[PDB]
Amino acid sequence: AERKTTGWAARDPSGILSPYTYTLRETGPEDVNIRIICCGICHTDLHQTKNDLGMSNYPMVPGHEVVGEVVEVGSDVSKFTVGDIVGVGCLVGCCGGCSPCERDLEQYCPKKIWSYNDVYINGQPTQGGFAKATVVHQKFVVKIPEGMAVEQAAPLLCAGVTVYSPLSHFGLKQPGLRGGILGLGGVGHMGVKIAKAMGHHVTVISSSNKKREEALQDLGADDYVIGSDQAKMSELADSLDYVIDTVPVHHALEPYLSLLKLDGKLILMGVINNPLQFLTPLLMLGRKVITGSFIGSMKETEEMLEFCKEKGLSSIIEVVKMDYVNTAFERLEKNDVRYRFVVDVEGSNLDA
Numbered sequence: 197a198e199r200k201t202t203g204w205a206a207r208d209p210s211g212i213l214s215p216y217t218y219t220l221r222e223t224g225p226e227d228v229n230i231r232i233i234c235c236g237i238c239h240t241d242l243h244q245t246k247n248d249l250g251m252s253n254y255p256m257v258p259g260h261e262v263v264g265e266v267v268e269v270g271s272d273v274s275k276f277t278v279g280d281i282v283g284v285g286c287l288v289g290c291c292g293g294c295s296p297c298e299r300d301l302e303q304y305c306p307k308k309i310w311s312y313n314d315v316y317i318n319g320q321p322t323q324g325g326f327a328k329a330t331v332v333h334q335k336f337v338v339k340i341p342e343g344m345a346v347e348q349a350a351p352l353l354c355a356g357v358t359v360y361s362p363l364s365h366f367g368l369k370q371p372g373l374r375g376g377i378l379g380l381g382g383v384g385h386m387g388v389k390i391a392k393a394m395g396h397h398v399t400v401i402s403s404s405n406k407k408r409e410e411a412l413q414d415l416g417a418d419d420y421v422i423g424s425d426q427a428k429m430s431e432l433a434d435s436l437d438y439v440i441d442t443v444p445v446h447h448a449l450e451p452y453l454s455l456l457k458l459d460g461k462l463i464l465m466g467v468i469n470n471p472l473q474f475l476t477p478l479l480m481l482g483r484k485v486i487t488g489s490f491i492g493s494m495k496e497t498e499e500m501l502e503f504c505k506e507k508g509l510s511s512i513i514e515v516v517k518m519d520y521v522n523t524a525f526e527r528l529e530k531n532d533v534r535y536r537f538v539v540d541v542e543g544s545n546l547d548a
């Protein structure tokens with residue numbers, strides 16, 4: 197009992213998204229009721245949607261990069277008022293007293309609910325951003341800058357911040373630094389963008405030679421080297437201050453750790469089921485660090501956006517309507533996209 201929406205949704209293993217109508221919760225007293233103007237896609241949306249864990253809980257509505265005007269607000273809600281273009285991240289909830297989120301790192305809290313494939317504090321499966329509206333916690337929605345486009349603010353709610361708060365916690369956003377972005381796409385792309393926008397010497401590393409166009413002449417990278425090329429990578433001996441990782445599966449790390457000078461950082465992002473490996477020696481050569489980052493806290497989701505505003509950042513997004521999502525996903529598998537996708541839920545949703 198809340199108020200009824202509609203919205204596209206998967207149902208079995210092979211993620212074919214049907215239409216789907218469902219009863220929301222109600223916006224009280226710390227909920228924000230939003231009308232979703234545009235959502236967005238990335239590989240997280242397929243990998244939930246397919247299982248790729250053997251964990252997917254159907255009926256499943258994808259959508260964690262959302263942006264759109266707020267139609268209703270709580271009783272204690274104060275921050276936002278109606279009619280604000282507001283956006284919301286991956287997280288929808290979390291508890292309240294665990295000191296992980298006394299000091300604002302609320303993503304590193306055990307009791308976090310996600311946008312979809314979770315179960316909220318009331319019981320309803322959290323359903324995504326592929327539905328023409330939703331109800332979030334007022335603590336898990338960030339407001340939006342004056343001029344930041346609704347297509348442009350969306351990807352940054354998960355891939356834009358994913359990479360920002362590594363380049364913020366490990367020291368890295370004070371200027372100068374050399375960095376090598378490994379795996380140019382999604383999470384690689386915003387890496388190149390925000391690190392080179394911080395006045396850093398960014399090198400792209402790659403499986404292929406192919407993403408050379410969307411790097412040197414499009415992203416603004418200072419170099420491009422193949423991971424599997426020993427002679428060009430050896431020139432980059434103890435070069436970079438950090439190396440980030442968008443590569444999605446079991447790759448060997450000591451290749452990628454060579455490219456690091458004294459006190460360098462390997463910051464792994466991707467969900468890599470299977471243990472990764474290292475020689476305790478190399479790390480002892482240069483006092484080198486291996487760690488992983490998980491998206492961003494809302495204060496740095498607040499920050500990242502107003503940062504992407506000031507240093508005016510962008511990406512080529514192919515805005516598609518809602519009746520083109522499974523074709524957008526097949527294209528996302530043949531990784532065509534046109535550097536990014538945004539689903540503007542200003543299309544096909546009505547009933548059933």
Ligand SMILES: NC(=O)c1ccc[n+]([C@@H]2O[C@H](COP(=O)([O-])OP(=O)(O)OC[C@H]3O[C@@H](n4cnc5c(N)ncnc54)[C@H](OP(=O)(O)O)[C@@H]3O)[C@@H](O)[C@H]2O)c1
Nearest residue numbers: 239240358379380381382383402403442443465466490491
């Ligand atoms: N905070 C987090 O922990 C976080 C945040 C967002 C997403 N993720 C997850 O991490 C993954 C990646 O991010 P994304 O979804 O935005 O898209 P994505 O990085 O564009 O996905 C593929 C990219 O990784 C590279 N790649 C693939 N296989 C590789 C290999 N074997 N060796 C080297 N490079 C390889 C490809 O570039 P090349 O062909 O040029 O090598 C390609 O650009 C996803 O599974 C996503 O769900 C984690």
Ligand SMILES: [Zn+2]
Nearest residue numbers: 238240354355
């Ligand atoms: Zn995402």
Ligand SMILES: [Zn+2]
Nearest residue numbers: 291294297305
């Ligand atoms: Zn907590």
